[PDB]
Design a protein around this ligand. Sequence first.
Ligand SMILES: *C(=O)CCCC[C@@H]1SC[C@@H]2NC(=O)N[C@@H]21
Length: 72
Amino acid sequence: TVSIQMAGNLWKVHVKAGDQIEKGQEVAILESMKMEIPIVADRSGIVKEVKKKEGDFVNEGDVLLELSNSTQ
Ligand SMILES: *C(=O)CCCC[C@@H]1SC[C@@H]2NC(=O)N[C@@H]21
């Protein structure tokens, strides 16, 4: 459902399976080779699955989150 938008490392994560998010709420943060980019929910929903973890490597179009309302 939600995906990373820049090359980097998933500095922090703020979602869990079964958690709730709302469009524009902070769900992760990128470090990007010493740059800083908040990662916010592309759409509201209940989280079904987190496709990465805090500290994982990530890239533009790499998966981040899967939502029950979007994986019906
Ligand atoms: C350089 O590679 C050393 C570690 C860089 C960590 C970076 S600096 C910008 C981001 N903010 C932060 O606290 N950590 C990330």
